[PDB]
Design a protein that fits this description.
Chain A: One of its GO terms (molecular function) is actin binding. Chain A: Belongs to the Mediator complex subunit 28 family. Chain A: Keywords: Actin-binding, Activator, Coiled coil, Cytoplasm, Membrane, Nucleus, Transcription, Transcription regulation. Chain A: It is found in: Nucleus; Cytoplasm; Membrane. This is part of a larger assembly, with chains A (119 residues), B (39 residues), C (42 residues) and D (154 residues). Chain A has 119 residues and is mainly alpha-helical. In chain A, 66% of the residues lie in helices and 0% in strands. In chain A, α1 packs antiparallel against α2 and α2 crosses α3. Chain A is flat, with a radius of gyration of 29 Å. The relative contact order of chain A is 0.06. Chain C is an all-alpha fold and 42 residues long. Chain D is mainly alpha-helical and 154 residues long. Chain D has 4 helices and no strands. Classes of the chains: A mainly alpha (119), B mainly alpha (39), C mainly alpha (42), D mainly alpha (154). Chains in contact: A-B, A-D, B-D, C-D. The interface between A and D is large, with 37 and 39 residues.
Amino acid sequence: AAPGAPRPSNSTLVDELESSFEACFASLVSQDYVNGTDQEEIRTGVDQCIQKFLDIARQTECFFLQKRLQLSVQKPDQVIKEDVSELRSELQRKDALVQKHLTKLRHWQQVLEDINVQH
Amino acid sequence: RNQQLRALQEECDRKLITLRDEVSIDLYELEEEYYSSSS
Amino acid sequence: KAAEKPGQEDHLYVLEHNLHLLIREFHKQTVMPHPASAPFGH
Amino acid sequence: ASGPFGGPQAQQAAREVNTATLCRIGQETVQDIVYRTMEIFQLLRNMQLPNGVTYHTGTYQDRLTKLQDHLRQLSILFRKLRLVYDKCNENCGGMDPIPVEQLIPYVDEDGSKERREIVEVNKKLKQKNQQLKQIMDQLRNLIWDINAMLAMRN
C-alpha cells in the first residue's frame, strides 16, 4: 500500500534486472493481434521502462561499489594483488606494442634499403 | 634523364610520406600507450 | 694530410630548407609569361 | 563454484581469492550488459524493409542472423550476472555489517582528537615508464620529418 510505513517485499536486486529487461519489450514481444492504429501512446511506457531499468542499474552499481569498498577496507591484500596484476598486464601490453613497432620499423627499413634504383 | 630521376625522387618522396603514414600510425599506436603509465 | 661539435638537434633537416629556398626564389623569378599572346609579363 | 563460465575477462582468474577482481568483473559485466542493450537497440533501429528495391533477399537475411548472435551474447551475460552475484554474497569473511556511516569518519582526515610487493611493483612500473618515455623521445622528435620540408614534399 502507499500510505503504509512497512515495506512488505523481498527477493530483489538479482531477478529484478531480468524482470525489468524482459517485461518492457512486451510492446514488441507479444503473441497477440496488434491494432494497426497507435501513436504517442506506446512512448510513455518505454520511457518508464528505461527509467526503471537505469534506476535499478544504478542501484546495482552502488551495491557493487559498496561491496568493493567494504572488502578493500577489510582485505587490502586482494586489492594490492589486483593492482599488481594490472600493472604486470599493462607492462606486458606496452612491451608487446614496443616489439610490434620495432618489427614494423625493421620491415620498413629492410624493404627500402635499396630504394635508390641506380647511379 | 631528368624526367627519369624525377621518378627517382617522386616515388621516393611518396615513400617518405608512406613512411610518415606508417610512423604516424606508430605515433598514434604509442600515444594511447603513453596514457597507461600511471607514474 | 672534442665535445662541443655535437649539440642539440640542429642538423640536416633544417638547412636543406634554407638551401632549397634559394633555387625556389630563382624559379619564382626566373615559367613562360603567355598572358594572352605576348605582352611578356608576370 | 564461481569460476570461468564463459566470461570475457582479460587476465582475471576468478578464484577463491581476489574478491575485488570479482566485484570489478561484475560491475564491468553489468556495464557491458547495459551497453549491449543500447547497441542492440541501435542495431534494430534501422531495420529497413526486407523487400528492398535492388536487394531481394541478400543483405538483411544475413544481418538479422548476426543480430541473433548479439542476442546470444547478452544472454550469457545474464548467466554471468548470476555467477558473480552468488560469489558477492558468498565471501562473507570479516566484519559482515561494516557500517559505511561509521566508515565516513574513518576516511576523514581527523576529528581534532606487507607493502613490499606493492612498492616493488610500483618501482618496476616507474622504471618501465621511464624507459618507455626514453624510447618515445626519439620517434617523438623525428615524428614530423616532413613539416619543415613541405616546401618540396609533393
